[PDB]
Structure 1
Amino acid sequence: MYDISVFIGRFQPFHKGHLHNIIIALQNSKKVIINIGSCFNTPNIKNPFSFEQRKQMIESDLQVAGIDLDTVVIEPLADYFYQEQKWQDELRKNVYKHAKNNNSIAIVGHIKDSSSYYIRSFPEWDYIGVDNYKNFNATEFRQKFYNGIISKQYMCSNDPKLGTYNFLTKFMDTQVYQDLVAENNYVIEYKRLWLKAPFKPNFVTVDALVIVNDHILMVQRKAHPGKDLWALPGGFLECDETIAQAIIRELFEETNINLTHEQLAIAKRCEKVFDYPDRSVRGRTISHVGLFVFDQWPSLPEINAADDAKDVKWISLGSNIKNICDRMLEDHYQIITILLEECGK
């Protein structure tokens, strides 16, 4: 009846529940646009699979199901935890890439949660609730998967040679899988330490974004989480320092930048708080990030990695940053984007 339905999910991984909702969508529309959220990020335990991997998984399960792939299109969405309007527009762009001169368009979202959000943000499309009487727990799936087990009742395919089932079987023979398991164990041990604390803690960290001649200073991580990923230099706030002091302390600690306090104090543009509750796999971590801008500087200050940085580099803006946009810790690509727009550049 509608020309286009719009379906949004993370699909980490795709499972029977996602499938049911796509079946409902197609009983109500001729074509379903599948938008995959949280694309263009490096693998982490919550988001182990890339856009292309998830897209391939979905296609293989829809064929198992077997839904005609001409009735299905798949598009990526980046994370915009702090810029909802960019996400809203990015979704629109995905749809109108496929929608034609006054196609009817409906979002086949969720009668329970998030419905309110889509209704308000997309008044111009209709809404179809589906929800959602079977509890397909994405976290529970991954936890067993990190323990070597693929939960069959989630899998569209019952044959390990096919579908997402097949993808996951092969994926367990990879180095990335081994890295995910290592990160996961790190996270389990970390959380265990905090079990008999009277309250769940909100952790506080700091980062420094240092721009010198359109080059960003980035460290390559030694430790979990985000082992081997690139990140802004930063770390935990200690109990006896101000945030402003911490930002500078961690910067020197990890990069040994050849600049003085006063030079950085002159260069400081702003601090911003990043508080999206799921930004970090460790627990609830809030980051305060200072922007420091140096223009027409005589050269790039000397730097060398130490403490929890195993490498450190100046990285020119434009192509070299965009290039590692999916090799960055947590939400740092978003943080860099926002500070350069709001306080930069």
Structure 2
Amino acid sequence: MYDISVFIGRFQPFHKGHLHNIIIALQNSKKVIINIGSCFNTPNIKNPFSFEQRKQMIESDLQVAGIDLDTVVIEPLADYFYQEQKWQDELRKNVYKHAKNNNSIAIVGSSSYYIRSFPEWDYIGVDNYKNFNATEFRQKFYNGIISKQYMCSNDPKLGTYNFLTKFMDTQVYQDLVAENNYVIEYKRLWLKAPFKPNFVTVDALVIVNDHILMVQRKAHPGKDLWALPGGFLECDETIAQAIIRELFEETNINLTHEQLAIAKRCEKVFDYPDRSVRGRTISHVGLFVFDQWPSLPEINAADDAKDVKWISLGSNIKNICDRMLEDHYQIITILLEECG
């Protein structure tokens, strides 16, 4: 009937619930565009696999009962938690790429967001079976258990099953297990709270001669990832004070607090509920700009930073965009745009 079905998911991992929904869409349309959300990030516990691995996983799963691969296309989406129009444009870009000859288009499926966001397209609704829970799957996986009832295949050499089986031997699997054990122990310790906690953190975006100051993380979450210098707000300091305290603790930047105060452009809040794996963490980020300086200030890593670097804007920043903590690539992008 439709020329095109639009299908959006995380696929962390791809399962039978996904295969049956694609199948409903392929008997309602001639071609499916599968849009994988949350790409171009480093692996974390909620997002273990890359775009390429998930794309592969999907293809080799579809290639087993049935399915014509000529009727299927796969495109990536980045996260834009604070700039939803960008996300919308990017999805529209992915679709216009495959449907620009007045093709008939429907979104197969956050059912209300897609209905509000995309009036141009029809919404094919799908209620599934027993709740295929991606968290439950992943938590058993970091415990050594692939749940074969989720798997498209039954053969451990076929599909996601084979990918998941082999993945358990990788270094990335270990890192993720380590991160997950950290978070379980961290979350446990906080069940004491009379009320579920919001964490308040601070970060500093410091630009000197078109370089951004970044820290490589010594500890979980995001161990060995690059990040803005920052950490927890303390009960006795203002946000503005915490921003500078963490900056100096982690990087020992050779600037005075007065200089940084003159260089300060703004402070923004980042409050996407799932930005961090510890629990709900709101970050206040200060932007500091030195259009020019005789040189890059001296920096020395300390505390939870195992390294610190001045990294130039443009290509060098883009090249570590998938080696950064949490939403820090978005934060950098936003603050330089609007503050700026």
Distance 1:132 1:288 in 2: 40
Q: Which residue of 1 aligns with 2:260?
A: 264
Q: Which residue of 2 aligns with 1:40?
A: 40
Distance 1:233 1:155 in 2: 41
Are the aligned partners of 2:3 and 2:105 in contact in 1 as well (CA < 8 Å)? yes
Q: Which residue of 1 aligns with 2:71?
A: 71
Instruction: Give 1:197 deviation, angstroms.
Output: 1.4
Deviation readout 1:120-159 (Å, 9 max, x if unpaired):
1111111110122320000000000000000010000001
Q: What secondary structure sits across from 1:153 in the alignment?
A: coil
TM-score, with structure 1 as normaliser? 0.98
Q: Which residue of 2 aligns with 1:167?
A: 163
Q: What secondary structure sits across from 1:82 in the alignment?
A: coil
Bigger shift: residues 281-290 or 61-70? 61-70
Distance 1:182 1:49 in 2: 16
Instruction: Give 1:195 deviation, angstroms.
Output: 1.3
Deviation readout 1:164-213 (Å, 9 max, x if unpaired):
00000000000000000000000000000011211110000000000001
Distance 1:274 1:252 in 2: 22
Distance 1:65 1:170 in 2: 22
Distance 1:141 1:239 in 2: 38
Q: What secondary structure sits across from 1:103 in the alignment?
A: coil
Instruction: Give 1:115 deviation, angstroms.
Output: 1.7
Instruction: Give 1:101 deviation, angstroms.
Output: 1.2
Are the aligned partners of 1:17 and 1:134 in contact in 2 as well (CA < 8 Å)? no
Distance 1:134 1:65 in 2: 21
Instruction: Give 1:320 deviation, angstroms.
Output: 0.3
Q: What secondary structure sits across from 2:247 in the alignment?
A: helix
Instruction: Give 1:161 deviation, angstroms.
Output: 0.6
List runs of 5+ in structure 2 lacking aligned partners. none
Instruction: Give 1:100 deviation, angstroms.
Output: 2.9
Are the aligned partners of 1:35 and 1:74 in contact in 2 as well (CA < 8 Å)? yes
Bigger shift: residues 283-292 or 63-72? 63-72
Q: What secondary structure sits across from 1:85 in the alignment?
A: helix
Bigger shift: residues 192-201 or 69-78? 192-201
Bigger shift: residues 32-41 or 119-128? 119-128
Bigger shift: residues 7-16 or 120-129? 120-129
Distance 2:268 2:128 in 1: 38
Instruction: Give 1:67 deviation, angstroms.
Output: 1.0
Distance 1:87 1:240 in 2: 39
Distance 2:77 2:219 in 1: 28
Instruction: Give 1:65 deviation, angstroms.
Output: 2.2
Distance 2:57 2:218 in 1: 32
Q: Which residue of 1 aligns with 2:96?
A: 96
Instruction: Give 1:296 deviation, angstroms.
Output: 1.7
Are the aligned partners of 2:17 and 2:129 in contact in 1 as well (CA < 8 Å)? no
Identity of aligned residues (%): 100
Distance 1:329 1:193 in 2: 23
What is the CA RMSD across the aligned residues, in angstroms?
0.6
Q: What secondary structure sits across from 1:64 in the alignment?
A: coil
Deviation readout 1:297-329 (Å, 9 max, x if unpaired):
111000000000000000000000000000000
Are the aligned partners of 1:51 and 1:76 in contact in 2 as well (CA < 8 Å)? yes
Distance 2:52 2:62 in 1: 15
Are the aligned partners of 1:40 and 1:50 in contact in 2 as well (CA < 8 Å)? yes
Deviation readout 1:258-295 (Å, 9 max, x if unpaired):
00011000000000000000000010000000000001
Instruction: Give 1:116 deviation, angstroms.
Output: 1.5
Distance 1:45 1:132 in 2: 25
Bigger shift: residues 178-187 or 60-69? 60-69
Distance 1:336 1:100 in 2: 34
List runs of 5+ in structure 1 lacking aligned partners. none
Q: What secondary structure sits across from 1:37 in the alignment?
A: strand
Distance 1:133 1:173 in 2: 32
